[PDB]
Design a binder for this molecule. Structure first.
Ligand SMILES: [Cl-]
Lengths: 95, 95, 95
């Protein structure tokens, strides 16, 4: 599994969120952040199976790219385990 | 060492924080975030020795689980080094 | 590449940000967080080439260290890929 962390322009949040839900993303975490003066951005984090990473990356790029400066970046970070707090299920069972 | 990132319901913050302090957690970072409409959640991050990961995971699960939807998830991410800014100490010496 | 995540005192933000820009950091993400009562802190994230990690760590330590309690910590986390949303460039080309 991998954590996908994307820093995007605030106004692109609803479009990226919808596009991700369309391709089957079960959950996501959003944080208000600042970046580059410091400009407001939105950080999205989703953790997915290794085999779903590329589709997610493509979708975020297609949806948030405007062609102008400050569109953001996407980081792929390794995740060694995921645990669902409600059930205690782990790994694939916890998504 | 591993970074443990848990996304929980806001109201469970004081209980999880206390339970973690009880099992010896020296420090933690908390961020206000939104997730799943977007609902408010609390993100907790602690970085601990490999041998302390499971105890921390169990404690968070026991403390934040309500059995209802949206209890959250816990991600275990690898950390290659930790540096204490005040002293410059690293690794085990920086916790 | 590696993600460098540093939790610092709020007042040190402008100095650390400037010092990092001086050593060639192209971008950074800042989040308002709380840590240790919970005290306000600032989280900085930069993702850099493996060979630039130590210089960045040194710079953050030199700039944010006051010698007092609560100066913070720096975590080095592995990043398997970086994608620039504006162009779709990856890895070294996406910084
Ligand atoms: Cl991370």
């Amino acid at each position: 599994m991998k954590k996908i962390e994307a820093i995007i322009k605030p106004f692109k949040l609803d479009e990226v969120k919808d596009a991700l839900v369309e391709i089957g993303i079960g959950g996501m975490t959003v944080t208000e952040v600042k970046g580059f003066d410091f400009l407001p951005k939105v950080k999205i984090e989703v953790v997915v199976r290794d085999e779903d990473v590329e589709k997610v990356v493509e979708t975020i790029v297609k949806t948030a790219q405007t062609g102008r400066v400050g569109d953001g970046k996407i980081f792929i970070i390794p995740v060694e385990d995921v645990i669902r707090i409600r059930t205690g299920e782990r790994g694939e069972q916890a998504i």
